[PDB]
Every structure is written in structure tokens, then in C-alpha cells.
């Protein structure tokens, strides 16, 4: 039954600009497409219908066309509450199937992430487990790699990522990465080191500390 | 105001057993029909079931017949979504809809109550400060922090100096660990001066498991 195609899966641009978007699917449904707008928390609400209709309330530079396999939502121009993921979905025929999303993204100018280590508290150590953070904060554009070096030696697998969403003041992103061992493997070793690669700044960046008995 | 709040969502074990509410109000329920949907965690939607007015036929989705049954009081106005033998992939939240004019497109929506289908048992988290061994400078902004590790289920507030400091913060989105239990940090970013007479503490609150705690960040 009829996958639906949404390309790209994201899209950064600035406000102000006009956005379009594309919504595919595998065969015809001719007009039964309708268009979902999903502000990050909050519940989906119904943007355009019948692939041409605005629903009430929805403002005048959201705009539904094509017809037949291939279609598009555009946003005239672009305002801070435009930045949101947008769905679409067949009903021309059964069972009921959504595309799989675009994220509109704010373009931004380029931007210098501060990195901080943060040292496993002793209250952790005793429980027999250890937490380093690295804090990559306040940045753009989201790609970004952090690499953990123990004793100058290379890490994989003990460690998960995370990060905000653009932030409503400075449109920019923050970043966790988090190292897990446990107090026997931690305490037997000595220079625990953050290396953060990224656009933003000259060569890679490497903040440290060591146990220091 | 058209209304739709549903209700009866938290933590189940598989192959438990969920009832399901949507509670419609600002209109004439007894004239539409109505869905469930559901998106994953973090993923896209899916169709679940619906109904039409009276109640007389229903109609669900391959990965949720004989299991999930749609139902309806018209006299209290409030949809009913019951769930049987609930897979882990059952996980999600769940919206009701109702559907607009004369075919299938969904032209009103309810906020959601989130489905969390598990083995693993509530846990209140434990909370761990964010101090920088970072003893120096004059380095310009200055860092510090909330480890929130080990809780289950979702959701942990987190905020600071009881609601007094919002500036600079960054609560992170939680993260499902090997072990199978969520941890997020929350960190605070402000520029050295302020920090002479201000202080600095988390407020860590976990209603699943009554949990609120208040970590201060010793400074240095």
C-alpha cells in the first residue's frame, strides 16, 4: 500500500524566505491530500485539505498545490512559528498512510560552540559507576563530532549523544556526550580529554583534566 | 472551545491491558466520526482505528486488529480507545482526531496521552552535580550542572533557583541507556560576575515515582 514520500527530510532557511516543500507518492491519488503542521510539543493541526483548501484560521501564506503523484506545500514567507515539522497524507485510498516529515530548520550564521569536561562527582564514584559530560554550547550548524580520548587512547561504544532543538533566543543548538565506566575502569587510568571537531573554529578542539591523586 | 483531552495514558507491562479516553467538548459529538493515532517515540505517524457516529462500525489497522477495540459514549461524549496484549512496538502517544467533512483527513486533534509498554519497573532518578574541576579563569562564560541519571518512565522537569535563573539554560531530551533506564543532564551557562552572590541548585522533579529533589552545585 501507498508509502509516501517527503523529501527532504529537512530544511534550513531563513525567516523571511519562502519555502516549499515535497510530498510523493507511489501511485495517483489525484486530490485526497491533505497537509499537517506539528510545532515541536505541541498536537498536529490541520494546514491544507483537499490538496488546494486552507482550512479556517490558517493564514493566507500557507498554500496547497499539485495533483495526481506529486505535490506542494508553500510557505510565502517565513515566520518564527512557521518553524515546525510538516506531514501530508493519501485518503484516496485504504488504509489511511502519511508521509514521513520535513523539519523546517532557521539558517543561521555560523557559530562558535564552547566546550566544557565535566569531571565524575564522587557522590557518583561511590555507587561504582562514572559519568565524564562534555558540553558543546551554543553552536550552528548541528553537525558535529566529539571524540573521547582516555590516556590519549580512542573510545567507542561507551558513550551516548544529545541535543536541544534551536533555541528561541539565538536559534542555536547545544550538545551532551556522556561517558560511562565504572569506578574500577575509571580509577585505573589518567587524562580523560573531550575532542570536539566543527565548522565553526580553526583546528579540533580539546578540553582535559586528570584524577591528579 | 472545541475540545478534545484524552486521559488514561502512562506504564504498562506487556501483555497488559489499557483503556483509553478522549473527552470532546465545544461541539456535536454525536454527528462525526472519530480516530486514534499514534506516533512512536521520536518517529512518524500511523493510523489506528475509527468509527463512525452512531458507533455501528468500526474499522482498525493490520498491526492493532483483534487486539485494539474502538468504542463510544455518546451521552458523556468521549471516545475510548482498549487495548489488549500490548507489544513493546505498542509504545507511542496517542491522539484522538475526528475526522472532517464527507472523508478521511482529520481536521481536529487532541493534545495526547503518551503509552509506555515495558517490563522495567518505575525508578526515581538519582541526581549527580555538574561541577567543572575547571579551578581557573577569566576564560569568559563560566559552566555548571545536572546529571539526572537512571529514572523510568518518562517525563523528568528539571529547572533552577526554584524558577529565579531560565537565562542560559539547557535542559538536554532524555536518553534511553543500555541498562534500559533514561538519563538527561541540564546545564547553565552565565558569564563569571553574577556568580559572587548567586547561587546555584536543581530542581529535579519525578512525579512517576515522587521524587523531587534539589541539588546545589558547589562552586569554587
Known amino acids: 500500500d501507498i508509502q509516501m514520500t517527503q523529501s527532504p527530510g529537512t530544511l534550513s532557511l531563513s525567516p523571511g524566505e519562502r519555502a516549499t516543500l515535497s510530498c510523493r507518492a507511489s501511485?495517483?491519488?489525484?486530490?485526497?491530500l491533505a497537509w499537517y503542521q506539528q510545532k515541536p510539543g505541541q498536537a498536529p493541526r490541520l494546514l491544507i485539505y483537499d490538496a488546494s483548501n486552507r482550512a479556517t484560521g490558517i493564514p493566507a501564506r500557507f498554500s496547497g498545490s499539485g495533483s495526481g503523484t506529486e505535490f506542494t506545500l508553500t510557505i510565502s514567507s517565513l515566520q518564527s512559528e512557521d518553524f515546525a515539522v510538516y506531514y501530508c497524507?493519501?485518503?484516496?485510498?485504504?488504509?489511511?498512510?502519511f508521509g514521513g516529515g520535513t523539519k523546517v530548520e532557521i539558517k543561521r550564521t555560523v557559530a562558535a560552540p564552547s566546550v566544557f569536561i565535566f569531571p565524575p562527582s564522587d557522590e557518583q564514584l561511590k555507587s561504582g559507576t562514572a559519568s565524564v559530560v562534555c558540553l558543546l554550547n551554543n553552536f550552528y550548524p548541528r553537525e558535529a563530532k566529539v571524540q573521547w580520548k582516555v590516556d590519549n587512547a580512542l573510545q567507542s561504544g561507551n558513550s551516548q549523544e544529545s541535543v536541544t532543538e534551536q533555541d528561541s533566543k539565538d536559534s542555536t543548538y547545544s550538545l551532551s556526550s556522556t561517558l560511562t565506566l565504572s569506578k574500577a575502569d575509571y580509577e585505573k587510568h589518567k587524562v580523560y580529554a573531550c575532542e570536539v571537531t566543527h565548522q565553526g573554529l580553526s583546528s579540533p578542539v580539546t578540553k582535559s583534566f586528570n584524577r591528579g591523586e | 472551545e472545541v475540545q478534545l483531552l484524552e486521559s488514561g495514558g502512562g506504564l504498562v507491562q506487556p501483555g497488559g491491558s489499557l483503556r483509553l479516553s478522549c473527552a470532546a467538548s465545544?461541539?456535536?459529538?454525536?454527528?462525526?466520526?472519530m480516530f486514534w493515532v499514534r506516533q512512536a517515540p521520536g518517529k512518524g505517524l500511523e493510523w489506528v482505528s475509527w468509527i463512525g457516529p452512531s458507533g455501528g462500525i468500526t474499522k482498525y489497522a493490520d498491526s492493532v486488529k483483534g487486539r485494539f477495540t474502538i468504542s463510544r459514549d455518546n451521552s458523556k461524549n468521549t471516545l475510548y480507545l482498549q487495548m489488549n496484549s500490548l507489544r513493546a512496538e505498542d509504545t507511542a502517544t496517542y491522539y484522538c482526531?475526528?475526522?472532517?467533512?464527507?472523508?478521511?483527513?482529520?481536521?481536529?486533534w487532541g493534545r495526547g496521552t503518551l503509552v509506555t509498554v515495558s517490563s522495567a519497573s518505575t525508578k526515581g532518578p538519582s541526581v549527580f552535580p555538574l561541577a567543572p574541576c575547571s579551578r581557573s579563569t577569566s576564560e569568559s562564560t563560566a559552566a555548571l550542572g545536572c546529571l539526572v541519571k537512571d529514572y523510568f518512565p518518562e517525563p523528568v522537569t528539571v529547572s533552577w533557583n526554584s524558577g529565579a535563573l531560565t537565562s542560559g539554560v539547557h535542559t538536554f531530551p532524555a536518553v534511553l541507556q543500555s541498562s534500559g533506564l533514561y538519563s538527561l543532564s541540564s546545564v547553565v551557562t552565565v558569564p563569571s560576575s553574577n556568580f559572587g552572590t548567586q547561587t546555584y541548585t536543581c530542581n529535579v522533579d519525578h512525579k512517576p515515582s515522587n521524587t523531587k529533589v534539589d541539588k546545589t552545585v558547589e562552586r569554587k
Open positions: 482526531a475526528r475526522e472532517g467533512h464527507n472523508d478521511w483527513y482529520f481536521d481536529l
Open positions: 465545544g461541539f456535536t459529538f454525536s454527528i462525526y466520526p
Open positions: 497524507q493519501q485518503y484516496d485510498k485504504w488504509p489511511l498512510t
Open positions: 501511485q495517483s491519488v489525484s486530490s485526497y
